[PDB]
Amino acid sequence: TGYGITPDTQIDAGALRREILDDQITMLTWTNEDLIFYRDISRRPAQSTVVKYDQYLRHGNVGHSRFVKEIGVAPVSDPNIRQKTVSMKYVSDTKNMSIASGLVNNIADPSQILTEDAIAVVAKTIEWASFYGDASLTSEVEGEGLEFDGLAKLIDKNNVINAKGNQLTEKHLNEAAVRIGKGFGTATDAYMPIGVHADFVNSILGRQMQLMQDNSGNVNTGYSVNGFYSSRGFIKLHGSTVMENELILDESLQPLPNAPQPAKVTATVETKQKGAFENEEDRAGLSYKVVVNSDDAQSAPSEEVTATVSNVDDGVKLSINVNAMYQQQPQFVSIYRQGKETGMYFLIKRVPVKDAQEDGTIVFVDKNETLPETADVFVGEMSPQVVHLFELLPMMKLPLAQINASITFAVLWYGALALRAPKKWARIKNVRY
Numbered sequence: 001t002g003y004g005i006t007p008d009t010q011i012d013a014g015a016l017r018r019e020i021l022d023d024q025i026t027m028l029t030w031t032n033e034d035l036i037f038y039r040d041i042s043r044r045p046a047q048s049t050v051v052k053y054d055q056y057l058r059h060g061n062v063g064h065s066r067f068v069k070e071i072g073v074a075p076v077s078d079p080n081i082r083q084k085t086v087s088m089k090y091v092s093d094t095k096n097m098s099i100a101s102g103l104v105n106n107i108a109d110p111s112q113i114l115t116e117d118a119i120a121v122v123a124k125t126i127e128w129a130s131f132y133g134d135a136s137l138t139s140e141v142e143g144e145g146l147e148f149d150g151l152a153k154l155i156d157k158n159n160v161i162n163a164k165g166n167q168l169t170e171k172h173l174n175e176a177a178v179r180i181g182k183g184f185g186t187a188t189d190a191y192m193p194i195g196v197h198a199d200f201v202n203s204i205l206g207r208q209m210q211l212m213q214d215n216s217g218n219v220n221t222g223y224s225v226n227g228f229y230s231s232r233g234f235i236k237l238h239g240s241t242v243m244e245n246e247l248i249l250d251e252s253l254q255p256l257p258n259a260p261q262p263a264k265v266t267a268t269v270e271t272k273q274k275g276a277f278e279n280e281e282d283r284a285g286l287s288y289k290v291v292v293n294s295d296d297a298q299s300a301p302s303e304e305v306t307a308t309v310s311n312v313d314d315g316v317k318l319s320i321n322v323n324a325m326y327q328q329q330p331q332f333v334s335i336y337r338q339g340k341e342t343g344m345y346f347l348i349k350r351v352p353v354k355d356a357q358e359d360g361t362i363v364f365v366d367k368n369e370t371l372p373e374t375a376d377v378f379v380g381e382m383s384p385q386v387v388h389l390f391e392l393l394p395m396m397k398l399p400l401a402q403i404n405a406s407i408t409f410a411v412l413w414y415g416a417l418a419l420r421a422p423k424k425w426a427r428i429k430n431v432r433y
Helices: 097-101 111-131 171-182
Strands: 043-045 056-057 080-082 321-323 364-366 377-380 387-389 417-419 425-428
Touching: 080 377, 097 387
Parallel strands: 043 387
Antiparallel strands: 056 080, 321 364, 377 425, 387 417
């Protein structure tokens, strides 16, 4: 009031006559441009039913048999198997504008800030849909609304485990490049996260020292590493800055979301008291922290291996984390994710396994793998004949019908990601950040 002002909290019950100011928004987040794997994947349409056919070769029999005197035996050529892969439908849109707050005075808003929020949220859910989730066998056998994953199905012989999270020693990349060698192809790219492509620089390499006749003072230091080449020359387009699963919001940011429509918090996983049979050393005991119930159609337990087990490479496997799932229908729970321990050290959770759901009673999960560090980096050949993204209908927006004098709103399809060469690509696990 009166004379003298500031800092004064502008309630006019706390204040005087003076006129506050305001600005243009400044986005600190993942942007749209900052997505990469979704930017470079080549894309062709699948005009189809949600399925389609992919026709795929494996070759003849040569050996000591065929060995040439007069005639052969049975010139049976090939299997040529065929493999479908389904499309998937994943618009995620709850958009609203109160005709009140669309018509008042604004900041540049909203129906541009909304379309951005949409096209961004879906077109991120694409590449995240590419890097992790397979079709998790759901409440009962079928596909699911989840995109049959880009790199989960890949793993057959190409995942070179780093027995513990270690550096990228440039020997591993070489190994994944000869693995993709025997698959008749030459790995041209690499990806994810930016918490490796640094620690592949600041930890290991770039420590050549040039102590020369060299001027005092002004000179650079350090090293910036792209264009690695081993068997065959390539680039690492790398450092997405995106991980969703890897860092679980199961941290203190854990928030029940309307436990009405959020399936009931899982029974805090039955404590293993881990017994040592399955491949492992003799680990410690294991503890459990009651879960924080999660979004539409998923419940996620927490702990895995807690106290003493974590001295290097004991391969300590929490024996039975038995998740007792009891739910009143909200969305009958499907994926019950065991998101493993805080880390040996820096306490924020991680995500070892999304396990599709069957027992007939409590889910059973043995453990040790991948646990817990930021891990993957994905090397292989991106080229329209190898990693290929099927767009049933491109991203569109359709309006909807009004009831509450709000306005609903939507974006639309993407479809699925199909490999033509499930062996010509490679992913290595348990790197570090």
